[PDB]
């Protein structure tokens, strides 16, 4: 295939979008942006499939062209804009704010946040490099580069960004005992305290994480996102508090809710 591809088959779209099979052949094909194609949520999917504010794609376009949607404090009129982890979506006309946080089953949940909490976000740091007359530079998972960071900030750390200004306010160092979320793999969406990190030089590093219920699970280092310092998260967690129920206890909970209903 000469040149880049511009379409996305519906059955070839990422499964966490929860797209059906009979609506069409194609999928929204996220635009290039701060988040990778497989790990993002396009604006149209969120605005139409998730929130049901629009019934068709044309209605999503009509919504976005009145400049009502803001992603991390900036008006975004692109309906296929890739909104990813920890992004803040603000709709002032109706007055709500959402944070894209993975659910326990590895899907972007509709998570409403208070307007006070919509003024900042947390970003994982991807690399630090010195350039241009010895000025340090940070690169985050959100593709934003910040010059003059705190010298203590190292790779795999987490920084709190004020969305209005774009500057760092504080940070969490990657260390055992700090709370984290898994942003990829089998344990995606799970929240727990880092227990141990084993280093394999020349290969991937494995991080062990223990839930609040005592369950343990491993991931790769690139799949770990520091959420809070110690046991306390710096953001609000979704309704499922990051713990994964087995199918048996999920069925028991569903049956109990059914019995208590009515």
């Amino acid at each position: 295939a000469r040149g880049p591809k511009k379409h996305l088959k519906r059955v070839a779209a990422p499964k966490h979008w929860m797209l059906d099979k009979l609506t069409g052949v194609f999928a929204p094909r996220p635009s290039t942006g701060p988040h990778k194609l497989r790990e993002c949520l396009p604006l149209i999917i969120f605005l139409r499939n998730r929130l049901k504010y629009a019934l068709t794609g044309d209605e999503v376009k009509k919504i976005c062209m009145q400049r009502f949607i803001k992603i991390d404090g900036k008006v975004r009129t692109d309906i296929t804009y890739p909104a990813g982890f920890m992004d803040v979506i603000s709709i002032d006309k109706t007055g709500e704010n959402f944070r894209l946080i993975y659910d326990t089953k590895g899907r972007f949940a509709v998570h409403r946040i208070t307007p006070e909490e919509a003024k900042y976000k947390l970003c994982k740091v991807r690399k630090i490099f010195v350039g241009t007359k010895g000025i340090p530079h940070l690169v985050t998972h959100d593709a934003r580069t910040i010059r003059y960071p705190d010298p203590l900030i190292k790779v795999n750390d987490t920084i709190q960004i004020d969305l209005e200004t774009g500057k760092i306010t504080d940070f969490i160092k990657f260390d055992t005992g700090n709370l984290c979320m898994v942003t990829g793999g089998a344990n995606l969406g799970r929240i727990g305290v880092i227990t141990n990190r084993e280093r394999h030089p020349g290969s991937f590093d494995v991080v062990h994480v223990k839930d609040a219920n005592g369950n343990s699970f491993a991931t790769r280092l690139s799949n770990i996102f520091v959420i809070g310092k110690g046991n306390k998260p710096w953001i609000s967690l979704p309704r499922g508090k990051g713990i994964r129920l087995t199918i048996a206890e999920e069925r028991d909970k569903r049956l109990a809710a059914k019995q208590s209903s009515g």
């Binding site: 088959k9 099979k21 009979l22 609506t23 069409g24 052949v25 087995t246 199918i247 048996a248 069925r251």
Partner: protein, 180 residues
């Protein structure tokens, strides 16, 4: 590329020996006793029972404490109890292997309509169902092979838009009354 789905199944299987006295007699007995149209209905019920037995046999060989065994065994037993085939007091996995074809044939809407006294024969029951005289709860059901759920059994009525339930005379009564 299109936006269509191609998943489909065959609901029955055909017997390997086409002509044998015992199988033919047993199938004819079932057809006559439950008012079935042909042998494909018998083979359809046989196929569902065979799939259920295969799933149960797969689960039995697993460990008792195996979470998969517990989960799908509980699901299978609850599905079988829900449609009335199994007894709640016999909710162990091995009892699934004791089920027969008549148990699944007794839960059809045709046989239940006959048993409830809405019809005077199994064939009268079939023609009553296919003629839109029978409803389950509020929905008019038109399909004789409607496996009646255990909770849904108590709501089987005469379909109040029908002459037998709603007291509106049909074509024949109206025409014969116009002749007077």
């Amino acid at each position: 590329p299109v936006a269509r789905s191609w998943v489909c199944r065959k609901t029955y299987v055909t017997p390997r020996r086409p002509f044998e006295k015992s199988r033919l007699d047993q199938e004819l007995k079932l057809i006559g006793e439950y008012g079935l149209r042909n042998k494909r209905e018998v083979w359809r019920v046989k196929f569902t029972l065979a799939k259920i037995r295969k799933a149960a046999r797969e689960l039995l060989t697993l460990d008792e404490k195996d979470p998969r065994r517990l989960f799908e065994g509980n699901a299978l037993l609850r599905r079988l109890v829900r449609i009335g085939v199994l007894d709640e007091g016999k909710m162990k996995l091995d009892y699934i292997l004791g089920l027969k074809i008549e148990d699944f044939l007794e839960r059809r809407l045709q046989t239940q309509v006959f048993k409830l006294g809405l019809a005077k024969s199994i064939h009268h029951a079939r023609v009553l169902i296919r003629q839109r005289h029978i409803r389950v709860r509020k929905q008019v059901v038109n399909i004789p092979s409607f496996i009646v759920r255990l909770d849904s059994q108590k709501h089987i009525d005469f379909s109040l838009r029908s002459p037998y339930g709603g007291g509106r005379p049909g074509r024949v009564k109206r025409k014969n009354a116009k002749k007077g």
